[PDB]
């Protein structure tokens, strides 16, 4: 597999199990915040890491529970971090669900009991505020038309528009017809730095967990998990409110079962931005994590062949652009589930290492 600057297990099954990673880079701090669900999904945990370029390594501090990221009598899941570069505030969106509830029970029961929450930190994640239940104000009446919903999982997005809008990728299971609820991706939008929220319009049916990135004029690309053999990709020219164009990207395979979550980010093109995406590449199972490059975003056909990042069992992942790397090329940080969900691995590499022919 691809030569990397670092490969370290940051979460391991012990007294608890860990899944659903989220990664967030704090530019001015040369540090990363790695989030995950601590399952018996009861709570969300976090580990802070300081990146030292001279040693090509990130030093990870002790794991800590995000105590405030929970509602009484509920399980917390789907950590979705975001850093507001204008207010200096760190956001951690997440979903809370009643304890007396499971997952399969959520998908179809026609009774939505899922809550949308957020906690903020003004000291780089050291301490957090009390949770804010955004459910009613951010969703509205539509709430009753869904069996359930979720955000991310994974890092969110802040646009370079006038308002420096906050965009939270998400999806809802909607009771459309004698069938089972059908999932459609969408984005929660805020133009006042998380003060108030609005629900964006749905993308094509049969799209789940997704992530968004901003490209160059201004377009928001959405990459979503689907129930088909390929990923679904959509574009928005109005900051996420509407995702007009939408299509299957055959080049980006989805494992047989129900597919698998993937990650996507934009980063400064070496030559304004290029995209990077990570997801299992095995056509019959969740294995062999691959990195894909799109140097002519968002063109679906411009997606490249995947480069092998890690062999073996691999699932969910999250990416973060970490600025300039040791070799002068774009540096990347990646967090992914591995070995039948026995751990979550941190991987750090550069564009030169992954796509030598494009740098």
Ligand X SMILES: CC(=O)N[C@H]1[C@H](OCCCO)OC(C(=O)O)=C[C@@H]1O
Binding mask 110-149 toward ligand X (x if CB under 6 A, else -) reads ----------------------------------------
Is 337 known to be catalytic? yes
Active site residue 37: no
The b/e string for 87-99 (b: 16+ C-beta within 10 A; e otherwise) is eebbbbbbbbbee
For ligand X, the closer CB: 77 or 220: 77
Q: Of residues 65, 85, 107, 228, which one binds ligand X by CB under 6 A? A: 107
**CB closer to ligand X out of 317 and 329:** 317
Provide the Cα torsion 346, 350, 354, 359; round to 10°: 170
Which residue has the closest beta carbon to ligand X? Answer: 103
Q: How far apart are CA 271 and CA 253, in angstroms?
A: 28
What residues from 300 to 359 belong to the interface with ligand X (CB under 6 A)? Answer: none
Choose among 177, 181, 184: nearest CA to 210: 184
Residue 235, H or E segment = strand 230-236
Instruction: Pull the structure tokens for residue 312.
Output: 């073996």
Provide the minimum distance between the beta carbon of 159 and ligand X in the complex, in angstroms, as a whole number.
26
Cis omega (within 30 of 0) for bond into 58? no
Q: Kindly give the residue spans of alpha helices, DSSP state H, lying in the chain.
A: 104-107, 135-139, 351-354
Shortest Cβ 176–ligand X spacing (Å): 15
CB of 20 to ligand X, least distance (A): 5
Any contact of residue 228 with ligand X (CB under 6 A)? no
- Residue 245 Cβ vs ligand X, minimum distance, rounded to whole Å: 24
Of the pair 150, 187, the CB lying nearest ligand X is at 150
Q: What is the total count of residues that contact ligand X (CB under 6 A)?
A: 8
Bridge partners for 93 per DSSP? 80, 118
User: Binding residue per annotation — 171?
Assistant: yes
Closer by beta carbon to ligand X, 47 or else 286: 286
208 touches ligand X (CB under 6 A):
yes
**Beta carbon nearer to ligand X, 103 or 136:** 103
Surface-to-core class of residue 185, CB atoms within 10 Å of its CB (0-12 exposed, 13-18 middle, 19+ buried): buried
Cα–Cα distance measured from residue 293 to residue 211, given in angstroms and rounded to the nearest whole number: 16
Q: How far apart are the C-alpha atoms of 86 and 162, rounded to whole Å? A: 11
By CB under 6 A, residue 151 contacts ligand X: no
Does 103 sit near ligand X (CB under 6 A)?
Answer: yes
Angle at 24 between CA 21 and CA 29, to 5 degrees: 145
Residues in 247-306 that interact with ligand X by CB under 6 A: 258
Q: What does the block give as tokens for 350?
A: 């550069």
Q: Which residues are at the interface with ligand X (CB under 6 A)?
A: 20, 77-78, 103, 107, 150, 208, 258
Annotated binding site: 19, 39, 171, 173, 209, 225, 286
Residues within the annotated binding site for substrate?
19, 39, 171, 173, 209, 225, 286
Catalytic residues: 316, 337
């Amino acid at each position: 597999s691809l030569p990397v600057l670092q490969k370290e297990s940051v979460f391991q099954s012990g007294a608890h199990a860990y899944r659903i990673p989220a990664l967030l880079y704090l530019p001015g701090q040369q540090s990363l915040l790695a989030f995950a669900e601590q399952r018996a999904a009861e709570l969300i945990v976090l580990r802070r890491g300081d990146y030292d370029a001279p040693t090509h390594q990130v030093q990870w501090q002790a794991q800590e529970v995000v105590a405030q990221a929970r509602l009484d009598g509920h399980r917390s899941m789907n950590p979705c971090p975001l850093y507001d570069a204008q207010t200096g505030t760190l956001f951690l969106f997440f979903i809370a669900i009643p304890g007396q509830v499971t997952e399969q029970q959520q998908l179809q029961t026609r009774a939505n009991v899922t809550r949308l929450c957020q906690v903020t930190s003004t000291d780089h994640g050291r301490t957090w505020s009390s949770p804010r239940d955004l459910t009613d104000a951010a969703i509205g009446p539509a709430y009753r038309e869904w069996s359930t919903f979720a955000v991310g999982p994974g890092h969110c997005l802040q646009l370079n528009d006038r308002a420096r809008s906050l965009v939270v990728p998400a999806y809802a299971y909607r009771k459309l017809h004698i069938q089972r609820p059908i999932p459609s991706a969408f984005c929660f939008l805020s133009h006042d730095h998380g003060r108030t929220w609005a629900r964006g319009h749905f993308v094509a049916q049969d799209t789940l967990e997704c992530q968004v990135a901003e490209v160059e004029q201004r377009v928001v690309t959405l990459n979503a998990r689907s129930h088909l053999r390929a990923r679904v990709q959509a574009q928005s020219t109005n900051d996420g409110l509407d995702f007009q164009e939408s299509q299957l990207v055959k080049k980006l395979v989805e494992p047989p079962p129900q597919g698998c979550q993937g990650s996507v980010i934009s980063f400064p093109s070496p030559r304004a931005q290029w995209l990077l995406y990570t997801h299992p590449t095995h056509s019959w199972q969740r294995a062999d994590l691959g990195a894909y490059l799109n140097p002519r975003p968002p063109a679906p056909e411009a997606w490249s062949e995947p480069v092998l990042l890690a062999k073996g069992s691999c699932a969910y992942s999250d990416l973060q652009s970490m600025g300039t790397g040791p070799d002068g090329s774009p540096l990347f940080g990646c967090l992914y589930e591995a070995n039948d969900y026995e751990e979550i691995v941190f991987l750090m590499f550069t564009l030169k290492q992954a796509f030598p022919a494009e740098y």
